[PDB]
Symmetry: C2
Subunit: 594 residues, 2 copies
């Protein structure tokens, strides 16, 4: 008749791992479009959705279960014990000043590195040694984009690109290097911006064709304004899975961005273009949003570093997901050092988040690791083995287990077996928590006739989101509190939680799916198996490359840490990067700086 | 923006162009068989959704939730900035016991003068009678028990209480009597009788929230936080009060147990949803009662019944052990027959849960100095915000006249300045409130209703639940963005004024339509007038109090509402004490019982 729970009294020894995959048929092309027309049909559409929610257990969770916890509408963090062996940064420092402090946290630059990706400090040294100039690098990047059509269908990196704007900024940066006063280590560094983040002079479409018609861009987002103040060069707007409602990167409007390691495979989503352009070496870094693993997933599949920061750590003003409760804006880069430097530039809460969320002052890790590494070795690594191993290929669990052994051997890290209850409830709570504000912010435009302009993938999701009731939303926030309590208790015993980033490597794109998208829940299920807690509960998490599977496809490891502990997850990731450097040059790669 | 889709913003709105909008709520009144058939249509598989979608389209809620771009981010719970500390108050510790706070509260009152032993009795009158052995708590209990059993106030068709155990009451009164004879009373509340609304847990009674069945699915093994605090002071818990079912109504109509009647006129509603709580106090049977307020459910009946009802800041008083814990608009507050009594009960029950303490970060509780004059230099410094078009939008001009007279008396006797203010987007506030109160109420009851117990609810509640079930999750997000807008407006108002003053209700106690007694009614234009002024305090969390200020042309009580800054209960209580000085409750209700005689 009805079931009941309670979180603080749950016997953790009785918690069982729930392994059943959400099952649904894979649809592409005409069958997919007919299915969406059925979903949007006045009467039978609701009937279908109600059957889907009853079959996957969401109705039992939202409507047939007594939940004793009060709702947690946004991540609520208790005071955390201060991090160990970190540098405390002022809360109201400028990005320029934070970059000066960030350089002091890195090992001394050795001009012997100028396969290995180029680093931000390699560019910065080349600009200052007049070995090259930002204008020349810009011409080289502009040449490659125009030659291969990376700003055009059918496989673009960028869906908004103004070569004159890029030349304009690069000339101003070159002039500052010629005059001998660069703004910072980021002066002249090229950064790509995901199309759900505002970046002048470009419009923001979120991967749609039409959003610019209804939402204009008057000023830079907070993250872009901070990068621009450092002298960084904004390259353009990156392709993405439409409005963040996907984890593959499939885009019917502009074409699907291809994985540089294998152009027949997906990049991962939704920050598809951002990850690909960095993996190909065209630009140093990119910014992306992560609401459902949207930064970490494509970073893992494309073999780069993606950092998901604590909820509210980085001001999201000027983006399509501002006001959301699961999303962040984070960096993607081809090395830990580069991702750390971009984080130093963009971090900083909005004024409202500063009072509401009460973050501890940002901290930087000491990556020069001497005196070291007593800090890394004292870290306790939580492993949920049944969860850790639930992957499609043993290559993934093998490669990530090897990294844990390497950390124990070289530093002394202790791996602690943990249990994470109610992963099924977490997925249900996350989908309605990310989908309700996304649908809500677009509902006036869609009610005004623009719903048919969306892709069939988005329209499938929106048909599901429209069936979520307000009372469903309340119940899901009560589940958020349950999962927060479970994770905070785990964080009493361990410092981080380690998993593979994804349950599969880069999947091949079904050719029939390029025409008008697809629905393939079994693929989206494997891709989101490990990432959702960082979003529903707000913890920071990073994806760091740790090798390749039998077919040479990159494998990612996820380190999720305590609230506001980016410095901890960054330092542990730097130790992982020491033990597992990225060695394979991607099939699609460009050696700028030559 | 009047065309394809509508747009807004808040911090850039020119306050001088904001026009007051009239009641854009239109509906027909239904009772009895017409009502039942309408609920069956609303619950019909296909036509029900069509009717609700039409109703939401017609009252403007669809335009607000789905056709309007809202630029503010959501505010999911009231978010209060740091406030300026109150003037001329006594700070009480954050972790003091209710016994200790009562001792501090007594020092804030004028010295007790036994020269007064019409006027209701006061808690200190009882306390002096117990201590001077004029009477005993056992005598008072037997007198109260006698009246209840004689008039059937614990049974249909017009009960005050829906759970009553006379033996439990006697039991408690004997133990209190023992402590008075032994010469060690616990506090000024030892022996004082308090009624508990039926959505608050109070041993040994079950909690039904005015339903017939909720006890089957939700047991009560512990006192609520508020009852545990009262019980530690020696107060006598009289029983569970009647209420509008599950707090989903503002009249007090209850088809399950019978409708509690207004003691000033037994043919009229008490107001809701704290119907029983208010009536029993107005009749003088007990000193005070606890209720919940989520949509004015404490203030409305308090006003209609001519008593004082205090709605405290969101999170000020721990709600653990009640049907509305975890909600975002509700509080538990006291109802008493004088400001002094309400102040003493507030002192006992206050204090946040640990979760609310950390999330809401309340400033430590403060008590007003009612000594007082002067004293009244602090009262005269208060700036009183008045939104005139809103203030006067009442059904009977007696209400605006009587409330305006109080403002003039405050200006002339204390020097208070009345400042003209504007409250924009009152229509958006009603829409945001309805979905914010309805969604958690429906959510916490959905597993029982899905289990087949939805038909056991009243047709009134089932009408609301059919509407709440049409609210989407995206609608809920949009409503929380409206909450932030209205919070900004009101916080800006509280830069220029210290309190916002309105009538408590837009009408006095309405007559119960006889056909509405069998299975309830739907009467939106009555609920509209009753909720006109009380929403902000719930949606935004501000404290507000209803104080009696006189009577209309038919002798029905009129209430004035004073809404203050977050955590400013002391300011609100102090100003209400000054209003009570200038407008004492003079009329004895038609239904009144003189205990202590």
């Amino acid at each position: 008749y009805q079931v009941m729970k309670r979180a603080s009294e749950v016997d953790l020894s009785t918690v069982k791992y729930k392994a059943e995959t959400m099952k649904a048929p894979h649809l592409t092309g005409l069958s997919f479009k007919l299915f969406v027309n059925l979903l949007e049909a006045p009467l039978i559409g609701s009937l279908i959705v109600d059957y889907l929610k009853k079959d996957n257990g969401m109705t039992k969770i939202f409507r047939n279960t007594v939940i004793p916890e009060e709702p947690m509408f946004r991540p609520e963090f208790p005071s955390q014990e201060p991090e160990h062996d970190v540098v405390i940064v002022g809360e109201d420092e400028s990005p320029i000043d934070r970059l000066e402090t960030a350089l002091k946290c890195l090992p001394q630059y050795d001009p012997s590195r100028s396969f290995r990706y180029w680093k931000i400090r390699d560019y910065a040294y080349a600009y200052r040694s007049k070995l090259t100039t930002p204008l020349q690098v810009a011409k080289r990047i502009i040449s490659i984009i125009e030659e291969f059509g990376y700003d055009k269908p059918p496989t673009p990196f960028l869906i908004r690109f103004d070569a004159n704007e890029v030349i304009k900024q690069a000339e101003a940066s070159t002039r500052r290097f010629e005059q001998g006063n660069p703004i910072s280590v980021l002066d002249g560094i090229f950064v790509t911006i995901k199309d759900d983040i505002d970046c002048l002079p470009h419009p923001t479409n979120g991967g749609t064709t039409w959003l610019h018609e209804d939402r204009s861009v008057e000023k830079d987002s907070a993250v872009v304004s901070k990068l621009r103040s450092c002298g960084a060069i904004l390259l353009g707007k990156a392709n993405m899975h439409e409005l963040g409602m996907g984890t593959t990167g499939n885009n019917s409007n502009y074409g699907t961005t291809r994985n540089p390691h294998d152009p027949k495979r997906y990049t991962g989503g939704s920050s598809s273009g951002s990850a690909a352009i960095v993996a190909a070496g065209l630009c140093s870094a990119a910014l992306g949003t992560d609401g459902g693993g949207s930064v970490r997933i494509p970073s893992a599949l494309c073999g780069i570093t993606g950092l998901k920061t604590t909820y509210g750590r980085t001001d999201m003003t000027g983006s399509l997901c501002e006001g959301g409760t699961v999303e962040i804006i984070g960096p993607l880069a081809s090395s830990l050092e580069d991702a750390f430097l971009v984080y130093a530039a963009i971090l900083g809460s909005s004024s409202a988040d500063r009072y509401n969320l009460k973050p501890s002052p940002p901290c930087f890790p000491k990556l020069l690791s001497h005196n070291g590494s007593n800090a890394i070795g004292s870290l306790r690594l939580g492993k949920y083995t049944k969860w850790f191993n639930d992957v499609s290929s043993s290559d993934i669990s093998d490669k990530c287990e090897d990294i844990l052994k390497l950390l124990s051997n070289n530093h002394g890290c202790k791996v602690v077996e943990i249990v994470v209850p109610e992963l099924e409830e977490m997925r249900a709570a996350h989908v309605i928590s990310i989908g309700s504000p996304t649908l809500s912010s677009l509902t006036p435009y869609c009610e005004a006739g623009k719903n048919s302009k969306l892709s069939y993938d988005t329209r499938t999701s929106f048909a599901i989101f429209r069936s979520f009731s307000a009372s469903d939303y309340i119940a899901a926030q009560c589940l958020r509190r349950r999962l927060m309590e479970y994770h905070l208790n785990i964080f009493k015993d361990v410092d981080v939680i380690v998993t593979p980033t994804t349950g599969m490597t880069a999947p091949v794109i079904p050719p029939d799916a390029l025409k008008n998208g697809e629905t393939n829940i079994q693929v989206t299920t494997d891709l989101m198996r490990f990432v959702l807690a960082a979003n529903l509960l707000g913890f920071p998490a990073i994806s760091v490359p740790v090798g390749y599977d039998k077919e040479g496809l990159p494998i990612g490891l996820q380190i999720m840490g305590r609230p506001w502990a980016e410095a901890t997850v960054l330092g542990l990731a730097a130790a992982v990067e020491e033990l597992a450097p990225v060695t394979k040059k991607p099939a699609i790669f460009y050696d700028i700086l030559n």
